[PDB]
């Protein structure tokens, strides 16, 4: 619809696509099976997000009610944009920078942003995998090292050993972002191991990953299943599940609900990164990409809830343990206070016995101190993000027979999830570079892959500093925000108003021997564009409704166990502009440069 001339030349012709696949047998990679493509795309969607982000939002945002919006944006935007990404990659036979540059030269900014976004997300996801494999190496000790207090550190004596193994034994965390220190050697060692394991899998390319993706996408499901049948035998598991699916219909009427539900569909589908487009561009020209986008989204909606069932089974067991232990302490207090026979006082008659004791001896009873015991309170102690893996799941595992085994299986699963996600992000950084021909066409792709691995490894030394966890919680908070949505809005816009949906549906007709149903057309025209905008308007209604305040550990001061929280320094807005404005202003920024280089 927008008048771009010469566009036809930028793209290969439909008559020429029957002959291009018998000559791109050389000089372009190819999938070995269809299973190898579907498993590499499921792996990219599935990750540590749906482990410690999706389950938390599913409960915090109206529980059962939150599912309604999630599914709404999932089918209104997730599937529609996914299809558009698979189809445009299979048609134009290039990666993300290739596709947008052809649709129109000034659209080069889209690829630049997608490449900048993939570099920043993969920079911090490989520090999280660094931490996961530090906990996997420490999983070969009958009394797991987060099981007991170091003889006892007052800091560790307060809170718990688990809270001590993470902030001190593993992080050596500071009390502020203004407090950086020395590279934690063991942390650096684990960072090396993470980038090394990634290079071996992505050194050659989709070919090498093609083998790894299978296990990195299979192992997780097998282990997740083994965990469900174990989780549902641990007492209190149902309490947690019921807790996850209690519907708060009032939370539907909130602008903060639909933004997170919106941002989750976009990160959960790996959209606006570009890796997906590159993966699709290696299929046959006559591959059904309409049936592939429906199968991958169906598995992503089922996996999302299936992992939430496994997470809240452990949250329910861990809270049922806490509650019972506190109740037992309260009972022991009474028995010790009144020398009552053991077994005389029980969880059922504790209240009446408490009254009888107080009646008999009010002074003595007055001296007695009893803790508050509410299963709901323990249930509502669930942490969002790394805390759920390193602080909640690690502590529930220590209270389980065959403890080390369960810990091991739990860390290989998270490792596999993270690593499959990394394949996608690496695809998003390497392919654009070759589009820019950065690597000498002499140096093999492995050289470029290693360069990328070693360059991102050296920048990841910021997260091995004592303040490295405060940097990662900031980057993570501003790595998948508006930029991802912004890129996603312009990919949709560029396919419909610049390249024209007419060519798209026609090209769809050419590949799947049929044109898409009214659904696709309508969503790609109003449903998606309009819905994304209201998510874009919510961001400046919620991000502005918040403040730059981050939690700190601070072994001393205030209450060590209490989550002490402080504001951010004035220079952090420079970092947020860099992690937000930079990947959102190259789309106009390159489009203003190109429109004044010609004129």
């Amino acid at each position: 619809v927008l008048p771009n001339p010469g566009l036809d030349a930028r793209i290969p012709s439909l008559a020429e696509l029957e002959t291009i696949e018998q000559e791109e047998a050389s000089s372009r990679p190819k999938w070995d099976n269809k299973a190898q493509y579907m498993l590499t795309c499921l792996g990219f969607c599935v990750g540590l997000g749906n482990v410690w982000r999706f389950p938390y939002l599913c409960q915090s945002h109206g529980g059962g009610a939150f599912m309604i919006p999630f599914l709404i944006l999932l089918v209104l935007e997730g599937i529609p944009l996914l299809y558009l990404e698979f189809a445009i990659g299979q048609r134009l036979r290039r990666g993300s920078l290739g596709v947008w540059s052809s649709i129109h030269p000034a659209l080069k900014g889209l690829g630049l942003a997608s490449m900048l976004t993939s570099f920043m997300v993969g920079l911090y996801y490989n520090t999280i995998i660094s931490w996961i494999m530090w906990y996997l190496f420490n999983s070969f000790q009958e009394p797991l090292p987060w099981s007991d207090c170091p003889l006892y550190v007052d800091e560790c004596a307060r809170s718990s050993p688990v809270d001590y193994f993470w902030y001190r034994e593993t992080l050596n965390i500071s009390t502020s972002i203004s407090d950086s220190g020395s590279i934690q050697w063991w942390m650096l060692l684990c960072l090396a191991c993470a980038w090394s394991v990634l290079y071996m899998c992505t050194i050659r390319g989709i070919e090498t990953t093609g083998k790894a993706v299978y296990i990195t996408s299979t192992l997780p499901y097998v282990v997740l299943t083994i965990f469900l049948i174990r989780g549902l035998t641990l007492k209190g598991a149902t309490n947690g599940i019921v807790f996850l699916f209690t519907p708060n219909v009032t939370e539907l009427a909130q602008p903060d609900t639909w933004l997170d539900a919106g941002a989750q569909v976009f990160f959960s589908f790996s959209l606006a990164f570009g890796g997906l487009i590159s993966f699709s561009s290696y299929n046959s020209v006559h591959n059904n990409c309409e049936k592939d986008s429906v199968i991958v989204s169906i598995i992503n909606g089922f996996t999302s809830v299936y992992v939430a069932i496994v997470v809240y089974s452990v949250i329910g067991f861990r809270a049922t343990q806490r509650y019972d232990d506190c109740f037992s302490t309260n009972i022991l207090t009474l028995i010790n206070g009144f020398d009552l026979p053991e077994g005389n006082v029980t969880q059922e008659n504790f209240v009446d016995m408490q009254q009888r004791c107080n009646a008999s001896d009010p002074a003595a009873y007055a001296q007695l101190v009893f803790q508050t015991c509410d299963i709901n309170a323990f249930l509502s102690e669930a942490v969002e993000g790394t805390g759920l893996a390193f602080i909640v799941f690690t502590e529930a595992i220590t209270k389980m027979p065959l403890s080390p085994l369960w810990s091991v299986l739990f860390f290989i699963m998270l490792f596999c999830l993270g690593l499959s996600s990394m394949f996608g992000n690496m695809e998003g950084v390497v392919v654009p570079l070759q589009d820019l021909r950065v690597i000498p066409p002499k140096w093999p792709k492995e050289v470029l892959t290693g360069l990328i691995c070693l360059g991102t490894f050296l920048i990841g030394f910021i997260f091995t500093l004592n303040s490295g966890q405060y940097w990662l919680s900031l980057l993570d908070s501003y790595a998948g925000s508006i930029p991802l949505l912004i890129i996603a809005f312009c990919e949709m816009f560029s396919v419909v108003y610049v390249y024209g949906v007419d060519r798209f549906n026609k090209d769809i007709e050419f590949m799947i021997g049929h044109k898409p149903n009214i659904f696709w057309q309508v969503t790609w025209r109003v449903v998606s564009p309009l819905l994304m905008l209201i998510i874009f308007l919510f961001f400046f209604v919620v991000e502005v409704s918040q403040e730059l305040t981050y939690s700190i550990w601070d072994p001393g001061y205030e209450e060590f166990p209490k989550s002490q929280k402080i504001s951010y320094p004035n220079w952090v807005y420079v970092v947020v502009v860099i992690v937000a404005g930079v990947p959102s202003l190259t789309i106009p920024g390159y489009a203003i440069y190109k429109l004044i280089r010609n004129h």
Binding site: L136, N138, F140, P145, L189, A192, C193, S196, R204
Partner: peptide, 30 residues
Amino acid sequence: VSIWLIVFGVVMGVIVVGIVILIFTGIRDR
């Protein structure tokens, strides 16, 4: 001996062997 370190060593060994053979096949393309 900080078992974790021993686990780190063995894991690194497997990865380095894998990347070595991978780059080997990289030059082994005739």
